[PDB]
Design a protein around this ligand. Structure first.
Ligand SMILES: NC(=O)C1=CN([C@@H]2O[C@H](COP(=O)(O)OP(=O)(O)OC[C@H]3O[C@@H](n4cnc5c(N)ncnc54)[C@H](OP(=O)(O)O)[C@@H]3O)[C@@H](O)[C@H]2O)C=CC1
Ligand SMILES: NC(=O)C1=CN([C@@H]2O[C@H](COP(=O)(O)OP(=O)(O)OC[C@H]3O[C@@H](n4cnc5c(N)ncnc54)[C@H](OP(=O)(O)O)[C@@H]3O)[C@@H](O)[C@H]2O)C=CC1
Lengths: 503, 503
């Protein structure tokens, strides 16, 4: 068999006409079409091993357990704690409220408030409630987001090794009819995931909270906070009970074709070229590539021409997607040609590394602002009528944590949520998590992907009206052990090849 | 893939010319030859899962251990015990010699000698040394063979539950240059294997002994007898150390063609017809089918004709292979045509069931005498020059034990040994262990085989100048558990599918 297929895989051989004994003239009559059919099969089959979804697994049996000692409950602005204070009280603990203000975004200012606060038993932050937007210049950062990075920083500054937990509400979808209601808080989740990795000694976990925290949910939360679930840190809480998160392989409904005008942000970018070629191969009649540099960008003028030869008019535009009125200018402009944007693809991003201890608000802001303010602005303006697609580029760094990627994970998890939140209200949106496209890097367990195969991923996704998926080549037998080397986790236990390993 | 091959497997479809897109006229031009190539592949691949060899696994680390209490050492005629008595003495035990005589072949007569012999610690029989041939009328049974069945019978009669062990010397080949020197004793092995199954409470095991039992080998034997090896009952002892037996799958060198005259015993038989057809398909120009009935046998005259149409003169002969002078008559006869017998195939057998407690010497003799005296007689007479093949038909009931098959196992294990003994002296011989050919039976874990596939087994064997192999379809996941239900054993641990199960 391997012999047989190898022979057809390469072609230009008679090892077959031997092994089969059918003349020879009727071999190369069939050979290419068979050689094709297995090129195709080989490529569907590999791609298949690249797709993954995050999913929520019910906890069948929640070990009964209560809280002990003292717990600091960290809020801000006008974030209500009561409902959560009550659960910790009735769950057996003594509660220290620590309210914060915008000036605490400063890690020095904040550490000054952690006096009379050692030998705590646990810490609990409901800073994700602080969704307010204009309260820390000159950043565009969300209040609670900043305070969160602050809080983590101050505690490592102060040397407080007591375990920290973050609570969101409305940032996860356990599925069913569990709408995402506050995509913003998924930023904190994002940091949470990452802090798990960076400072595993003092990170508890993160918990989405149900619309209403009743008594049972109270008790449940208290048990989770206590330590009930061991190493299981990503947790949702519903009135139906408790779920922990897993990453699963996707199971191996229509067609898809680029109509009207297609917008692509991050045009000056690295991946942008592959996508634009690809889209021109799908019959794209007009591509708008947007990017601050835009026209006068290092590959801009030649790929413009390369696409103009295949029949695709591609207008380069210079615009900053962080600019409500520039983008509004451009959008309203084309509508006056008049175009119709049927598809947006949002690759606008600046990937800068940075650790949580090191980073500053301004690094954090720099990384987020393009992806994020990008999407909200696109989300505000775009017509939402007729435009049948709205694809967001994302990363596994953001379907789960990565060391030193806190902001990018924060930004990427927001994309997914904003995607889930839009679908929730009946609007189209796909957040797709790549995946590294084509050595220091490659030993981490990640493998690089062919841009075309990788775009096969995206085709399938677009055909299937997905809302969030990953497309990535992972060698789990080296990835997993790297990943867990400090902190252990069940996040990947349901990935078959990761099971074999565990045994 | 399964789709793809199914389509070609059955043929007469265009699901391919679709899935491939290569016209359609050039599909059925190739389809049959491809459809053939996978018929062939499918059949090599199944057959492959049918082949097995017995093999001997070195015991790396022999738990140090000695013997305790009293051991009865059972001999006969002029079988020397000393060398073995000394090992039990120096190995820490008190020794009761119990010599037997031909009249003890009677289980009543024998039980009268087991008075003053309870609360023994173990029993040891070296009855396999009694290879003498004319000492129990009217049977042709080997002395020690009969005494062995006797001994087992008397002990269950007497209710003595102390564990029994049988020693042979020269009946196994650990491989290397380990010649088989006394094929006869493998009969006792054969019973031994079976008694393991029938009365597992009082059976110890069986041990081949090295040419010379020195002190180290003494110590080793004493440890084996003590209980060192636990559940491991088939054991060889060499100066290099101790081996236990395993059944392994064979690994998936020339060609083979039936020349001159081919002799087939068991001609009137069930399998004989398939073989004769098969041999006529290999270009056999003359088949001698021998069998007491011979000419006037239930299918004889028509298969004779059926083979005469394909060009193969097949002479039916009436002869009893238990008759040194009849067989000599017939052999010498044909040489006077003159023929030359190039190939013998020895299927002459009477498969009657019978338990060890129930059986009588005469049942035991009936079953053996055809297979066995058959082969010795063939072995004595045949020219051994020019005749390039000498195939013996055997059974897994005889590559290992079966309940109630003691005699057939005894006879089948002798075939293998006589095969190994002939090769040892540079004579050709193949003992092939089938395998059931095509429901009460089939639930045991055995599956029936196509006569043609099954003969593919034999082809490969004959091409490869094998000396002993099995060809059998076994469902191990039901066979193994049936097999071990009373008595546990490692005999099959090295068969991959039996490992999975154990876990
Ligand atoms: N490359 C890879 O292998 C991987 C990529 N990804 C994801 O895929 C996407 C593409 O990555 P890649 O192309 O490598 O990233 P790049 O950094 O190459 O692309 C960023 C593009 O966005 C533009 N951009 C930056 N800031 C702004 C702004 N304020 N307004 C408008 N445009 C801006 C930049 O153009 P300009 O500077 O001209 O404005 C640049 O061309 C990313 O969003 C990333 O999350 C995920 C995993 C791996
Ligand atoms: N059938 C199966 O599925 C299996 C077969 N086997 C092995 O394959 C072989 C063939 O089995 P099968 O054909 O079923 O057995 P059969 O009982 O059908 O064949 C026995 C043949 O040998 C002849 N025979 C019996 N006694 C004597 C004698 N004293 N002299 C000459 N011939 C004698 C008989 O003919 P007549 O009475 O005319 O003399 C009979 O035709 C056997 O040796 C067996 O060990 C192993 C496992 C399964």
């Amino acid at each position: 068999d391997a012999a047989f297929w190898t022979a057809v895989e390469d072609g230009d051989v008679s090892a077959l006409t031997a092994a089969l004994g059918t003349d020879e003239d009727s071999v190369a009559a069939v050979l290419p079409a068979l050689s094709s059919w297995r090129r195709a099969r080989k490529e569907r089959s590999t791609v298949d091993s690249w797709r993954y979804r995050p999913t929520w697994k019910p906890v069948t049996k929640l070990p009964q357990r209560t809280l002990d000692g003292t717990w600091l409950l960290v809020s801000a602005d006008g974030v209500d704690d009561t409902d959560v204070a009550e659960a910790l009280e009735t769950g057996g603990a003594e509660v220290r409220r620590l309210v914060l203000d915008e000036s605490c975004t400063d890690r020095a200012v904040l550490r000054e408030r952690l006096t009379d606060a050692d030998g705590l038993t646990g810490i609990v932050s409901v800073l994700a409630g602080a969704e307010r937007t204009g309260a820390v210049p000159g950043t565009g950062l969300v209040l609670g987001v900043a305070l969160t990075v602050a809080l983590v920083q101050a505690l490592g500054d102060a040397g407080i090794d007591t375990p920290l937990w973050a609570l969101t509400r409305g940032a996860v979808s356990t599925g069913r009819s569990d709408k995402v209601t506050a995509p913003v808080q998924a930023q904190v989740t994002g940091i949470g995931w990452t802090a798990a990795l960076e400072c595993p000694g003092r990170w508890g976990g993160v918990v989405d909270l149900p619309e209403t925290l009743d008594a049972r949910a109270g008790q449940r939360l208290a048990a989770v906070l206590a330590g009930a679930l061991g190493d299981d840190d990503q947790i949702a809480l519903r009135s139906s009970g408790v779920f922990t998160r897993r990453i699963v392989r996707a199971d191996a409904a229509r067609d898809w074709k680029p109509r009207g005008t297609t917008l692509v942000t991050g045009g000056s970018g690295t991946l942008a070229p592959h996508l634009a070629r690809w889209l021109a191969e799908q019959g794209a009649e007009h591509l708008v590539l947007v990017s601050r540099r835009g026209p006068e960008a290092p590959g801009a003028a030649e790929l413009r021409a390369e696409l103009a030869e295949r029949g695709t008019e591609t207008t380069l535009a210079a615009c900053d997607i962080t600019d409500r009125d520039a983008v509004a200018a451009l959008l309203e402009s084309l509508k006056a040609e008049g175009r119709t944007v049927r598809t947006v693809v949002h690759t606008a991003a600046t990937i800068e590394l940075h650790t949580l201890d090191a980073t500053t608000l301004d690094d954090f802001d720099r990384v987020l602002a393009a992806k994020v303010t990008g999407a909200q602005i696109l989300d505000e303006l775009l017509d939402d009528e007729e435009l049948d697609d709205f694809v967001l580029y994302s990363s596994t760094a953001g379907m789960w944590g990565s060391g030193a990627h806190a902001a990018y994970v924060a930004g990427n998890a927001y994309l997914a949520a904003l995607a889930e939140h839009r679908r929730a209200r009946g609007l189209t949106a796909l957040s797709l998590s790549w995946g590294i496209w084509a050595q220091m890097i490659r030993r981490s367990g990640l493998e690089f992907m062919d841009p075309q195969l990788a775009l096969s991923g995206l085709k399938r996704a677009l055909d299937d009206d997905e809302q969030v998926i990953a497309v990535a080549d992972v060698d789990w037998e080296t990835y997993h052990p790297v990943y867990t080397s400090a902190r252990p986790t069940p996040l990947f236990d349901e990935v078959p090849e990761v099971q074999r390993l565990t045994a």
